[PDB]
């Protein structure tokens, strides 16, 4: 026997992700463009989820 919940799915509280990384982040859902250097199309089949690019800096040691 079933309970028939009537709300949209939401599992954010169960994933252990910090709040900053849930609300602030923007994801791109896209089929990656073909690499213009090659003619193969096998990398343009599936959809990809990626996150927005954040800051990268230089390490004071080793650069």
């Amino acid at each position: 026997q079933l309970i028939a919940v009537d709300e949209k799915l939401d599992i954010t509280t169960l994933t252990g992700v910090p709040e900053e990384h849930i609300k602030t982040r923007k994801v791109r859902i896209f089929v990656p463009a073909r690499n213009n250097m090659q003619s193969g199309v096998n990398n343009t089949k599936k959809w990809k989820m990626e996150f927005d690019t954040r800051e990268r800096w230089e390490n004071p040691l080793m650069g």
């Binding site: 040691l61 080793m62 650069g63």
Partner: protein, 144 residues
Amino acid sequence: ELVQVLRRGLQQVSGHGGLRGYLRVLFRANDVRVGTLVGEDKYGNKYYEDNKQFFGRHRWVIYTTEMNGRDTFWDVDGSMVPPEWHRWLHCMTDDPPTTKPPTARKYIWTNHKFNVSGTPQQYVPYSTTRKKIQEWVPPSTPYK
């Protein structure tokens, strides 16, 4: 056969240049065996061999008392062995660098250096690439 081993001990005492050399080698290496000299370093390390010993004790080195800049009468380490005698001493080959010298090159260090950690000669890492982003330099003259 007891007299034989005692005479062998006396022979080991006498074959190190007398009593003083015997005590010197005993307090410098905790070992008093006598073996056939194979060669000597330009830094002063001597290499001895005795094929009658078991594998691992058949080749050994008496280190020098003065390497590049430090006194090694007591403070010795395995990093004081030059690469050719390093290859001979670790049994990667059966041929000493005396009979089989290494190939000479113009970029090979003529002077071996030991482990220089803890000394002002220690290696300090740094980034070897140039600056990436170039900044705009404002003019040196007033604008009005």
